[PDB]
Every structure is written in C-alpha cells, then in structure tokens.
Amino acid sequence: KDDFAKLEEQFDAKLGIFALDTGTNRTVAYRPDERFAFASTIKALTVGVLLQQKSIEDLNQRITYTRDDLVNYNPITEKHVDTGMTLKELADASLRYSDNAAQNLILKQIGGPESLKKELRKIGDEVTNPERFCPELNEVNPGETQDTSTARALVTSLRAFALEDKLPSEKRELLIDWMKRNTTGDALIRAGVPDGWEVADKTGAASYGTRNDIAIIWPPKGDPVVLAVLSSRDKKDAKYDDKLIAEATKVVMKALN
Numbered sequence: 001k002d003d004f005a006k007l008e009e010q011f012d013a014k015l016g017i018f019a020l021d022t023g024t025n026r027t028v029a030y031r032p033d034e035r036f037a038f039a040s041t042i043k044a045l046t047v048g049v050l051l052q053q054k055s056i057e058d059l060n061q062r063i064t065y066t067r068d069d070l071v072n073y074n075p076i077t078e079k080h081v082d083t084g085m086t087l088k089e090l091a092d093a094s095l096r097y098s099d100n101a102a103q104n105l106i107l108k109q110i111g112g113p114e115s116l117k118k119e120l121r122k123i124g125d126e127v128t129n130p131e132r133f134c135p136e137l138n139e140v141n142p143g144e145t146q147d148t149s150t151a152r153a154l155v156t157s158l159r160a161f162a163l164e165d166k167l168p169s170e171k172r173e174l175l176i177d178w179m180k181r182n183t184t185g186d187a188l189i190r191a192g193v194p195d196g197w198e199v200a201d202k203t204g205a206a207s208y209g210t211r212n213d214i215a216i217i218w219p220p221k222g223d224p225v226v227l228a229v230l231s232s233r234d235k236k237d238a239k240y241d242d243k244l245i246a247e248a249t250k251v252v253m254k255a256l257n
C-alpha cells in the first residue's frame, strides 16, 4: 500500500494495480477502479473476441490492405502489403509485436469498437469503453472515459477469455501461446516476476505517459496469477519509465507470497 505510493512518489506517476491469485483467490488492488487509457492492452481482448467469432479454420481468411492503412508502428504488416495477411497472422502480429495496423484490421473484422464493446458487455465487463479505431491516433485527456478501462476490469476480462469459459480450449490455447510469446514486454511485468516462471502479457503505451501491461503469470507449480499494472502521468507529453511497471510487479509478487 505504501510500497505502491512509494513508487508513485519515485516515478511521479499514478499507478493502477489489480492482481488475482487464482490458486487462493487472493487479490492486490491499488487504485483498482481508476481509469487509464487501455492503449494496446485492448489488443488481447480484441483477439479474444475474434476467436469467439471464428473457427480456427476461418482464421485462414486473408485480409488485403494497402500502405494507406498503415500509420505509425507496423513492424509486421508493413512487410506484407503485397500479399495481405491471414487473420491468424494478424493476431500473431498484433499480440506479439503490437502491430497497430494488424490490430486495426482485426478490429474491423470483428465489427469495430462498437462490436468490441457489445461483446465485452456480454461477458460482464461494464467498464472497458472501446470507442475509436486506432485509438492511439487521438489523445485521451484527463477525465475522458473513451478508450479507457481499469486494472480490475482488464484483469477480469483477460481472465474470462484466457482462463475461464469465454473460449473453447483450443482457442484459449492460441491466445495464451501468442501472449506467452510476446516480444514487447521484457522490461515490464516480465522483469518483476521470479526467474523461470511463465508469463503471457500484453503491453500498451499512450500519451500522458501512459504505460501498461496486463499478464497471466504461472508459478512453477500451481494456479496462475492474473495481473494489470496501468500507469499514467500529469503531462500530455510526459515520459514513461518501464521500471515503474517492473517495480510495481515486484510489490504485487511480494504481496502474493
């Protein structure tokens, strides 16, 4: 409690923390219901919904696109404009590289932010507010609730898809594999977790120094932890520091042990 305030003190930032130990039902909450721009963590839920709406076979559908559908951070999708990419390959790119264009293509496919919100409401997430495609292209100003969620809701919806019954097991397995194989999170939740332990995570970064990671974390032996660490700062062009996330993860891990 004061460890998390210490981190807020040390990094001049606001933290939102929610963790669930699914083995004991122990919880670690710190501003659990405070809203942050969810930023690219929404990609994990976007794929959950894609997977609910498609057989694994249907993920082989090819999606074509041009250079004009690519804006900022498209490491995978910029390599394939000639051929396009299948839904499967877009999911991989979106989750493991946070390919922004891949995300936009998947979001279109599922019916846009309106359909994403519909499906999240259906799983009992009253908080996550998808509003815009690309939502990184627009600022979430303090007090704005469009494209925001909370640590607690993000954990709840992530557990629903990844760990519970919102997906049949072969699709839940695909989601988990992609997340475990994320390339973008080494300095975040993964840097705060004990060595060896498996981590499936999805990162995000926006304006106002927003720096997020959501994860499922497995102990050698036992049930997983599901965790959201959301952060933001006072100023629109504020810098973030990944260390804040890693260190907040350390505190959660302490508290769970």
Ligand SMILES: *C(=O)[C@@H](NC(=O)Cc1ccccc1)[C@@H]1N[C@@H](C(=O)O)C(C)(C)S1
Residues within 6 Å of the ligand: 039, 040, 041, 072, 073, 097, 098, 100, 136, 184, 202, 203, 204, 205, 206, 207
């Ligand atoms: C979603 O979070 C994406 N963010 C952006 O495109 C905007 C942005 C804002 C500030 C700094 C950098 C980028 C992509 N996801 C993150 C992430 O997964 O950490 C990237 C920084 C890779 S871009």
